[PDB]
Amino acid sequence: VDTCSLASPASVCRTKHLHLRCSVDFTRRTLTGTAALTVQSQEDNLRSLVLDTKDLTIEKVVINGQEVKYALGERQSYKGSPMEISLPIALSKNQEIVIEISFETSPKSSALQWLTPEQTSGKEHPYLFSQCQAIHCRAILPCQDTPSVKLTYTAEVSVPKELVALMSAIRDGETPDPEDPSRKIYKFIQKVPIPCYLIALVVGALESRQIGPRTLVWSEKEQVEKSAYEFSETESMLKIAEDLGGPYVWGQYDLLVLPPSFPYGGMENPCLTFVTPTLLAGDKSLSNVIAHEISHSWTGNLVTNKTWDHFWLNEGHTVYLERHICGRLFGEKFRHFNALGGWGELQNSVKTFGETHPFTKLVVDLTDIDPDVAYSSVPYEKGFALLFYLEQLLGGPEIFLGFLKAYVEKFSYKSITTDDWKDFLYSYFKDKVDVLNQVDWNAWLYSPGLPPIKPNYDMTLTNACIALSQRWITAKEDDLNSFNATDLKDLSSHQLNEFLAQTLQRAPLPLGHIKRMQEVYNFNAINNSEIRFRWLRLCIQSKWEDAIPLALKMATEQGRMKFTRPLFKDLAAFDKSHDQAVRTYQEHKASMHPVTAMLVGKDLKVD
Ligand SMILES: O=Cc1ccc(Oc2nc3ncccc3s2)cc1
Ligand SMILES: [Yb+3]
Ligand SMILES: [Yb+3]
Ligand SMILES: [Zn+2]
């Protein structure tokens, strides 16, 4: 049972295909069109079915060429409104019909962000992008908005002729719109069954450059060159990922660099990964996000969580594959460094919610919980830590990678639960069941807080970060003179980030220590978004007023939640910047991503 969806479950009827025909109206901020769903009955004598909708205007429902009766239920908060449709003829089990729905989206759709010319790089054209994960596909079209249903799709998108439409699918052509010469129709085909949260659309003044034999990087003209260099390791990562997970079934692996308000680091949309421009560090240092997005082509896209309570299956396995890719490219000592950093990030997540909080559980109960509110580092890191613990318990990376490949093969094109994963783990490791019976499963899967066991980590690359961090924490006024730019000479960008994360865990530090850290290390000059973020957090939490304009700027110039949310919270918790944070939020709210605006408002407790 999927508690986040109001649609008929997979045991009643299953959507097999979507044929989407729509037009993007920028003056009205609406998507208008038809969604023809091929639905297969799973029951005898089926006479009605329910679909998920969220702020959609329904014009009509057509079956067999005639209008049918439908009814829209009362809105159920973040879940939206149920749409019950009365079928004209009762269906037998396995019978397939085509239901065509005429719909229109709301300009306030929580799936979309409509950007004015001023909000883009070019300044001449508007832009539109979607983000359906977890449950925002219902805010675009009527569907069974659950990952337990996998469908194929085709689409025809009418857009102003000067603009380009792209989807999480293979490009199948473009023609002038016959009903309007100022418009262009873009055609798309997704022939691999996908859960509907993987449906994605972007409309804008987009340009592309080839960077690999199966990869184009897409972005506005101004970011093309930087993005092509930033993501040049894409193909080498795909090759490694194919070696670990088996064949790449999606044909194309394109990348799209979104405008700065993109709410996440990346989004694993089939054929076209969406990424934040905050990755454009200039040295490929933030490429682990591409490795994560690539890994999802197996773990998440092929093997999917049946419900949002099992989201850790998608994330945990993706982080595990991500760290193997980076370990193949940069060495095992580097995989351990990233694994160790991940544990640190889990420690922070558990502290923020509290060690008893239900969102610190690996397997959650999302009954009456908005998935956007539950979202955190927990499924990623507690999920990673479990797998890394099993890897060490079961005989190392080579043995565990064998399980992972077999896991993807066993569950490809299917939606699964934790019990399914656990059952196959025991089946796969039958000769090591006694070892598996030592795992405290109830604590690992169902308990809040830090895991009952911490894996073993190589410390080589972490040691210098720890030593530097401890020098700064234990320093007194008379020790500040000993610090010099030479302290950093042998530290990588990654190690510098880890020095800051280590220091930030013991924040606040005395104001004089932070003024000195700027004087000798000039952290204000670093443009790398991960470093800059942690450095500004450390300045604000340590009460440095000079950092207020800098943190406010970073929180509003980009909108990646990982950065925007803790910056606003830090600025709101600092007395000197509290009122500024509140006013800035209020002034930017209307031009923010709807989900970001929602969550920041909750974190700030603003009306
Ligand atoms: O990337 C965007 C996104 C992805 C998933 C999502 O929903 C969930 N987040 C969780 N965190 C913990 C446990 C379960 C869940 S379900 C919301 C937004
Ligand atoms: Yb074709
Ligand atoms: Yb001293
Ligand atoms: Zn992910």
Side-chain angles (χ1 to χ4, degrees), residues 1-117 119-433 435-607:
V1 57
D2 189 335
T3 62
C4 300
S5 174
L6 308 174
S8 292
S11 55
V12 171
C13 64
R14 288 159 195 199
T15 298
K16 279 209 168 175
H17 189 75
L18 166 68
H19 177 47
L20 174 69
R21 234 149 71 250
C22 65
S23 177
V24 181
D25 191 320
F26 283 98
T27 77
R28 298 188 60 241
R29 290 176 174 224
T30 57
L31 213 92
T32 66
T34 56
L37 305 166
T38 303
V39 176
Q40 182 196 55
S41 177
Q42 294 304 294
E43 298 182 335
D44 192 64
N45 195 37
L46 185 72
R47 291 177 191 267
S48 47
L49 64 102
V50 188
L51 299 169
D52 290 296
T53 70
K54 195 179 155 187
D55 301 303
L56 297 183
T57 308
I58 310 296
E59 170 181 27
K60 61 175 172 169
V61 180
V62 172
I63 301 163
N64 305 321
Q66 291 284 316
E67 285 174 46
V68 294
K69 280 165 225 294
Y70 70 94
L72 274 137
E74 211 174 285
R75 192 185 157 111
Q76 288 184 49
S77 221
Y78 62 88
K79 283 178 239 177
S81 299
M83 191 194 170
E84 189 174 55
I85 306 163
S86 306
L87 311 168
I89 321 158
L91 309 174
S92 58
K93 185 181 186 292
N94 300 321
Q95 199 177 333
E96 296 188 42
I97 67 172
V98 188
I99 301 178
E100 196 190 70
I101 308 156
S102 282
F103 72 87
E104 184 186 86
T105 62
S106 170
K108 288 103 189 76
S109 172
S110 62
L112 307 167
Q113 194 184 1
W114 297 87
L115 309 150
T116 65
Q119 283 174 295
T120 70
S121 297
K123 315 287 186 209
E124 294 190 352
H125 302 278
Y127 197 103
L128 168 77
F129 71 85
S130 68
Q131 173 59 38
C132 296
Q133 205 183 14
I135 63 157
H136 300 288
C137 194
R138 64 193 72 178
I140 289 173
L141 50 103
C143 58
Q144 291 182 281
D145 198 4
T146 172
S148 61
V149 173
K150 288 190 175 192
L151 57 141
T152 47
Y153 84 82
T154 55
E156 275 129 56
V157 195
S158 180
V159 304
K161 79 168 180 288
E162 63 271 39
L163 305 189
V164 177
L166 296 172
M167 299 198 70
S168 55
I170 304 302
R171 275 167 276 127
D172 208 35
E174 57 195 78
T175 56
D177 184 330
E179 309 157 307
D180 194 345
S182 68
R183 302 180 84 74
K184 228 175 190 178
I185 300 169
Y186 280 97
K187 303 177 167 209
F188 303 95
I189 179 141
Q190 179 54 263
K191 66 178 203 170
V192 180
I194 63 150
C196 71
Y197 74 84
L198 288 184
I199 295 165
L201 172 69
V202 55
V203 184
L206 298 170
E207 261 156 67
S208 67
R209 187 170 150 195
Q210 192 161 340
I211 63 149
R214 57 191 155 171
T215 308
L216 307 185
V217 65
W218 294 89
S219 62
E220 277 190 78
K221 193 173 187 77
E222 302 77 1
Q223 281 68 51
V224 180
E225 201 186 293
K226 201 162 185 171
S227 306
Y229 177 89
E230 207 72 49
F231 315 125
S232 52
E233 309 156 306
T234 296
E235 188 53 36
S236 68
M237 295 178 170
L238 277 160
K239 257 118 167 176
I240 295 155
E242 275 185 302
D243 194 70
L244 305 177
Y248 183 70
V249 309
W250 311 90
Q252 201 73 0
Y253 190 76
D254 279 358
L255 296 164
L256 165 80
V257 181
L258 280 299
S261 63
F262 191 64
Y264 305 92
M267 175 68 212
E268 68 267 30
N269 295 314
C271 314
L272 183 77
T273 279
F274 279 29
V275 301
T276 180
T278 73
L279 291 187
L280 302 174
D283 60 355
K284 321 170 212 263
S285 61
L286 306 178
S287 76
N288 75 286
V289 178
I290 306 302
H292 180 101
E293 294 326 322
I294 287 169
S295 297
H296 267 306
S297 310
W298 287 276
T299 57
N301 298 2
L302 275 184
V303 180
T304 312
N305 39 50
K306 212 168 173 189
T307 72
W308 301 103
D309 297 350
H310 306 290
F311 180 65
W312 87 271
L313 290 178
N314 277 22
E315 296 315 332
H317 290 85
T318 297
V319 175
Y320 185 86
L321 255 167
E322 173 206 331
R323 291 175 179 154
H324 268 297
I325 294 170
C326 303
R328 284 270 220 97
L329 290 163
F330 314 106
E332 182 67 351
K333 276 180 175 188
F334 191 61
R335 186 175 74 113
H336 275 250
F337 172 82
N338 299 312
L340 188 61
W343 177 273
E345 285 304 289
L346 185 57
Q347 285 180 310
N348 304 350
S349 247
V350 171
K351 230 185 188 193
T352 305
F353 291 122
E355 71 180 51
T356 55
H357 196 100
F359 300 177
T360 66
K361 292 177 186 200
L362 192 66
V363 170
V364 302
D365 177 13
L366 289 176
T367 291
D368 303 322
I369 310 290
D370 178 356
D372 292 345
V373 173
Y375 185 87
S376 75
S377 295
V378 172
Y380 292 86
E381 301 302 341
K382 188 188 250 185
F384 174 79
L386 182 47
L387 305 178
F388 191 57
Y389 164 64
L390 297 166
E391 166 193 312
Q392 297 179 336
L393 202 78
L394 304 156
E398 290 199 14
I399 282 156
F400 207 79
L401 275 171
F403 159 70
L404 226 117
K405 193 162 202 168
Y407 162 72
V408 166
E409 191 58 74
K410 169 82 175 174
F411 303 113
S412 278
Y413 320 107
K414 294 160 180 269
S415 298
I416 69 146
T417 72
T418 296
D419 289 328
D420 295 330
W421 167 87
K422 208 194 153 183
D423 193 283
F424 183 72
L425 171 82
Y426 268 79
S427 145
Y428 189 87
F429 292 106
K430 65 162 289 298
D431 291 347
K432 284 170 185 177
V433 158
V435 154
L436 286 170
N437 291 331
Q438 283 157 49
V439 176
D440 189 353
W441 291 113
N442 194 82
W444 275 100
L445 310 163
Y446 311 117
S447 293
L450 288 176
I453 295 279
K454 179 180 183 174
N456 306 307
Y457 305 87
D458 184 81
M459 299 288 269
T460 313
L461 301 160
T462 308
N463 285 329
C465 304
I466 291 165
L468 199 58
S469 176
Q470 284 296 123
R471 260 191 82 210
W472 278 100
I473 289 157
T474 72
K476 311 292 180 292
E477 188 180 288
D478 80 341
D479 301 297
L480 296 177
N481 180 69
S482 65
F483 299 110
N484 185 286
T486 50
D487 301 346
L488 323 175
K489 72 184 178 191
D490 292 306
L491 298 175
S492 68
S493 54
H494 297 100
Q495 276 169 317
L496 220 49
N497 190 57
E498 193 55 32
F499 157 72
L500 284 159
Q502 280 293 329
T503 312
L504 191 59
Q505 284 185 314
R506 287 84 176 177
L509 259 74
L511 184 54
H513 286 37
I514 304 308
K515 294 187 174 172
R516 180 77 177 152
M517 217 182 277
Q518 171 47 30
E519 188 171 31
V520 299
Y521 308 150
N522 188 18
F523 287 150
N524 280 355
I526 308 175
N527 303 312
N528 183 300
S529 71
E530 291 277 350
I531 297 178
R532 184 164 193 88
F533 163 72
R534 288 184 181 83
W535 161 245
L536 298 172
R537 282 207 83 194
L538 176 73
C539 293
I540 297 297
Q541 294 178 33
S542 306
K543 319 292 193 191
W544 197 15
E545 281 182 50
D546 293 24
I548 303 171
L550 298 189
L552 279 171
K553 199 167 149 90
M554 204 186 163
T556 57
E557 282 176 343
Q558 58 80 56
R560 179 185 175 181
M561 288 189 280
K562 179 185 187 171
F563 307 151
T564 293
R565 278 182 79 186
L567 290 169
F568 269 115
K569 254 204 159 171
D570 282 6
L571 291 155
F574 180 21
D575 46 286
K576 297 288 178 298
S577 60
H578 177 83
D579 295 353
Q580 285 167 98
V582 162
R583 288 189 299 258
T584 307
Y585 169 65
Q586 282 168 345
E587 285 162 24
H588 287 77
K589 186 170 176 68
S591 53
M592 275 174 79
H593 191 272
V595 174
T596 309
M598 190 281 285
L599 289 171
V600 178
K602 284 194 163 295
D603 297 340
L604 258 39
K605 300 163 276 283
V606 167
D607 75 80

